[PDB]
Design an enzyme around this catalytic site. Structure first.
Site, PDB file in Angstrom:
ATOM      1  N   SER A 221       9.419   0.227  36.635  1.00 51.83           N
ATOM      2  CA  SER A 221      10.643   0.335  37.482  1.00 51.83           C
ATOM      3  C   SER A 221       9.574  -1.034  38.513  1.00 51.83           C
ATOM      4  O   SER A 221      10.253  -2.040  38.227  1.00 51.83           O
ATOM      5  CB  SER A 221      11.078   0.473  37.560  1.00 51.83           C
ATOM      6  OG  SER A 221      13.013   0.816  37.862  1.00 51.83           O
TER       7      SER A 221
ATOM      8  N   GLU B  46      16.630   4.942  28.583  1.00 53.42           N
ATOM      9  CA  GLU B  46      16.143   4.055  30.111  1.00 53.42           C
ATOM     10  C   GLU B  46      17.494   3.569  30.805  1.00 53.42           C
ATOM     11  O   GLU B  46      17.370   4.107  31.805  1.00 53.42           O
ATOM     12  CB  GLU B  46      15.543   2.497  29.428  1.00 53.42           C
ATOM     13  CG  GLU B  46      14.183   2.219  29.385  1.00 53.42           C
ATOM     14  CD  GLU B  46      12.910   2.082  30.296  1.00 53.42           C
ATOM     15  OE1 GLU B  46      13.607   3.328  31.177  1.00 53.42           O
ATOM     16  OE2 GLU B  46      11.707   1.975  30.135  1.00 53.42           O
TER      17      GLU B  46
ATOM     18  N   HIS C 136      13.667   6.955  32.073  1.00 53.22           N
ATOM     19  CA  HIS C 136      13.725   5.953  33.229  1.00 53.22           C
ATOM     20  C   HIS C 136      12.948   7.151  34.139  1.00 53.22           C
ATOM     21  O   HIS C 136      13.308   8.402  34.432  1.00 53.22           O
ATOM     22  CB  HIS C 136      14.460   5.567  33.840  1.00 53.22           C
ATOM     23  CG  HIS C 136      13.683   4.548  34.818  1.00 53.22           C
ATOM     24  ND1 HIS C 136      14.134   3.353  33.963  1.00 53.22           N
ATOM     25  CD2 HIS C 136      13.833   4.357  35.050  1.00 53.22           C
ATOM     26  CE1 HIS C 136      13.266   2.376  34.721  1.00 53.22           C
ATOM     27  NE2 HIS C 136      13.584   2.746  35.859  1.00 53.22           N
TER      28      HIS C 136
HETATM   29  C1  LIG Z   1      13.494   1.296  38.211  1.00 57.13           C
HETATM   30  C2  LIG Z   1      14.876   0.684  38.522  1.00 57.13           C
HETATM   31  O1  LIG Z   1      13.269   0.962  39.781  1.00 57.13           O
HETATM   32  O2  LIG Z   1      14.508   2.512  38.447  1.00 57.13           O
HETATM   33  C3  LIG Z   1      13.405   3.950  39.145  1.00 57.13           C
HETATM   34  C4  LIG Z   1      14.518   5.362  38.733  1.00 57.13           C
HETATM   35  N1  LIG Z   1      13.512   6.668  38.962  1.00 57.13           N
HETATM   36  C5  LIG Z   1      12.749   7.132  37.834  1.00 57.13           C
HETATM   37  C6  LIG Z   1      15.400   7.447  38.553  1.00 57.13           C
HETATM   38  C7  LIG Z   1      13.893   6.281  40.105  1.00 57.13           C
END
Ligand SMILES: *[C@]([C])(=O)O[C][C][N+]([C])([C])[C]
Ligand SMILES: *[C@]([C])(=O)O[C][C][N+]([C])([C])[C]
Lengths: 527, 527
Positions: free
Chosen positions: B197, B324, B437
């Site tokens: 992410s 996601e 995600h």
């Molecule tokens: C990305 C946008 O950085 O998301 C990470 C999401 N998370 C694992 C739920 C913290």
């Protein structure tokens, strides 16, 4: 005599035609207007001054001047649609098939032929109304109207070429049917007008135009609706093309009078020869002279009329064929040939979409392509061909019809919708073309009954069902005596019409039609 | 001693941690920068002045100040991502897990945590690098960087808050790894940086930013790419939000100096409390302080850099999870709840798409809806929910990543793409959320090996395969020693990554990504 009939115009002498081991009367070539020749060219139709003596209606009339198709000389698949009689500006005539014994009061079915408004003949063999008349006991009338410049040249403002005159020729024959069909066994309070393509479009225009609504009861629209993009033009556009036609003939273009007069000295074929040179685009499924939204035949935009219920409320039966576009791609899109599988490359695909949606800007042609492309298999020729086929059809027939049906139904009194998807067993057109535009016609008129035509038993079956649905709808406002659901805006049911056990479905091509009826126009208006 | 290590900064005293019936060394909390406290807040990172004496790296460091999630207090499914240590502005520290016996020169894997750039901790349990270190014999480093205003507030032009400082904290730890990883058994010529992410986005930014390319060899990007719409902002935008944050704290806003100074007197949580009040839209999947395209860390628009090959050419392994978006809908879209099937009505669907694509005009939101709606079943709640789930994901992760992979591949030296689609057996999130995600992370770090966690045998299998793919890619630039195809622009192959026998596919979500990557932006630019 069963063949001598009296009408408010004069006596008429028919002939009896043999039908499926039996016979019926046929009064062919009865005139309903003054021959639109000479200074009357482009003029509104004039009522037929009555006559004295028996008018001899024993043989088909001339056909209206028109563009004859020579793309496939000798190919029956296409010549079956060409005028099979001398063409002449003296073509405003109607034909009546009447069951024998002459009924006292049966349902009347008036057929308005198709042809993009640039062609058509009430004399084609597939429009032979005797099997329907005979088989269903209906009085079948088939009228004719001026097509092409001759019927749609519109110099809005002059009374010499007001435009829509080909629509008034139909009204006029509807009038002669109203007034005289009683002397042939028909009930003028139960005439269903039906037509295909430019004819199904005509039908819907008589449903909208104030001055026609009263001349018929029910309507059957096949592969066409008044709102199809090729069905009408603005008065300005019609004027532009009118002038442009003048240019191609070296007419004084200083005034409508000089213009109209020049166009009237011209022999028929001179107008026909340059007819196609006036479209404003390189396009597929657009014809030059079509009805104009004049403010007379049509009070305002067909769409506001659709929106405000400003139309004849009654029952209507309408539908479309599965592959409406194939025919026009075959003739004006590169990559398609009558003798190959016409697999299409993206290069030719991308050219076909440009021809199919002439008015779209690039973002528009991008929206169409995104919607009709299988991005996970974009270089498939079969998929590009079929995809182009759906674009031509969805855009030009299926979606405008779905718009009409959904608008009409809000105010109508019964809508019945079919999806014809049967390829005749004996079709001489390439398989890639599918269930082609105009190929339900032959089932509707009962040709599948004449064995010397080689249709299959189940196709004969299907014909009879279709003739019954059509006749039974004409007489009662309902196709059923296995129910063909009524179409409602809420459920949107319709039925398949093929030799298999019918089935009901809902929402005919919604995905796509939301695209064409709602998204695309919104897109093209924004940009 | 295996736990005493010498580095160019000072000696470091690790601790040995037990791993799967065995042990390894862990040097936790080694600092790589001067504590960014006081007047250094918002400032670029400063190298750690060396020290004397053994630095005690026996326990995890503080976590950077950040927004803690209290949406589901006590719910493990969400708290497992919350900082599990005291938060502090003194958080720039790195952790190294080293196989025992200490290797002489193995592949190094540096983990950059995710969190929308507003959060993250290198100390979470799922980021526990010992099973990977142990299992794959790699030196696992996990760095930390300032998140939130503290790491991304950008007053472009001042040197007091240049922005991107959280990206320089990462570079800086990459530097400390370059320079010292040799004393721990790692080969500084074979470090693969990997992240998920905001971390996978960071990875790709180090691949683009000139000053970072040299500090690592290969890259693994998980559910993120530098070009994700939530990944960066213009300098003007970053300035706007910087000022706006000032407004919410009643800071003198007459100058960057007064502004920065005010923001520096503020206690950490005061900045955090108003952090979300600065976005310019009601949106889902947008965070306030993110990297700014400043012209320093990034020379020009990431897109022209993508277009001109202006990036580190090497091998990259990247991919996305199936669902996601679910996570962000659950938190900021109406209609979704952690405890219901979250079936969604069109009214809430139509609201979700507005939140998902904040920058779209109406025609835009109309294009999204037309594409993600089943017009033949438009009032299905399951379909509206899932459809919204695909919108959030396709738009924010899957399609920007597909753009990067296709652009990079043109100039890269080997691209490997996966589609993770396995829902852990023990997930405590509702089924409707799917393969969420951040849920591949736990497989990548080998938690499925620790039985007290209740994963299934086949999941253990899958973990080991993923750790091998990752480690084996790190060491050689190829995941394979059952071949995971190389992704090429021509064929576009990728593989599924789940407990079933892998399978290769092509063109990950092409239909949709042509829409988001090609059509939508074209649409929104026209209008
Ligand atoms: C990305 C946008 O950085 O998301 C990470 C999401 N998370 C694992 C739920 C913290
Ligand atoms: C409509 C547009 O009038 O088309 C009729 C097509 N045809 C049957 C091939 C002549």
């Amino acid at each position: 005599s069963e063949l001598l009939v009296n009408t408010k115009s004069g006596k008429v002498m028919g002939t009896r035609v043999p039908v499926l081991s039996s016979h019926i009367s046929a009064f062919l070539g009865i005139p309903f207007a003054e021959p639109p020749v000479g200074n009357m060219r482009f003029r509104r139709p004039e009522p037929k001054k009555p006559w004295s003596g028996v008018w001899n209606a024993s043989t088909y009339p001339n056909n209206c001047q028109q563009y004859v198709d020579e793309q496939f000389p000798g190919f029956s698949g296409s010549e079956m649609w060409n005028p099979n009689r001398e063409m002449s500006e003296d073509c405003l005539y109607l034909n009546i098939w009447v069951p024998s014994p002459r009924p006292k009061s049966t349902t009347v079915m008036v057929w308005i032929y198709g042809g993009g408004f640039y062609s058509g003949s009430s004399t084609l063999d597939v429009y032979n109304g005797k099997y329907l008349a005979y088989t269903e006991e209906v009085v079948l009338v088939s009228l004719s109207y001026r097509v092409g410049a001759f019927g749609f040249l519109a110099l809005h403002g002059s009374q010499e070429a007001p435009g829509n005159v080909g629509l008034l020729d139909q009204r006029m024959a509807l009038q002669w049917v109203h007034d005289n069909i009683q002397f042939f066994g028909g009930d003028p309070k139960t005439v269903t007008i039906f037509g295909e393509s430019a004819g199904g479009a005509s039908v819907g225009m008589h449903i909208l135009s104030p001055g026609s609504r009263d001349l018929f009861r029910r309507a059957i629209l096949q592969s066409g609706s008044p709102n199809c993009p090729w069905a009408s033009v603005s008065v300005a556009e019609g004027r532009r093309r009118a002038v442009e036609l003048g240019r191609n003939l070296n007419c004084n273009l200083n005034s409508d009078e000089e213009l109209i007069h020049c166009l009237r000295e011209k022999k028929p074929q001179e107008l026909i020869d340059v007819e196609w040179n006036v479209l404003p685009f390189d396009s597929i499924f657009r014809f030059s002279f079509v009805p104009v939204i004049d403010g007379e035949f049509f009070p305002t935009s067909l769409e506001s009329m659709l929106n405000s219920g400003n139309f004849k409320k009654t029952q209507i039966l309408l539908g479309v064929n599965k592959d409406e576009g194939s025919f026009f791609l075959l003739y004006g899109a590169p990559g398609f040939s009558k003798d190959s599988e016409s697999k299409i490359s993206r290069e030719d695909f991308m050219s076909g979409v440009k021809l199919s949606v002439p008015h779209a800007n690039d973002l528009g042609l991008d929206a169409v392509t995104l919607q009709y492309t299988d991005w996970m298999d974009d270089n498939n020729g079969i998929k590009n061909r079929d995809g182009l086929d759906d674009i031509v059809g969805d855009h030009n027939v299926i979606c405008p019809l779905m718009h009409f049906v959904n608008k009409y139904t809000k105010f109508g009194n019964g809508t019945y919708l079919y999806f014809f998807n049967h390829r005749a067993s004996n079709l001489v057109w390439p398989e890639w073309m599918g269930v082609i535009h105009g190929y339900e016609i032959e089932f509707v008129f009962g040709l599948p009954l004449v064995k010397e035509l080689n249709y299959t038993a189940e196709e004969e079956a299907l014909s009879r069902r279709i003739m019954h649905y059509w006749a039974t709808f004409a007489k009662t406002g309902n196709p059923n005596e296995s129910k063909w659901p009524l179409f409602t805006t809420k459920e949107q049911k319709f039925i398949d019409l093929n030799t298999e056990p019918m089935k009901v479905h809902q929402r005919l091509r919604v995905q796509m039609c939301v695209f064409w009826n709602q998204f695309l126009p919104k897109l093209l208006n924004a940009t």
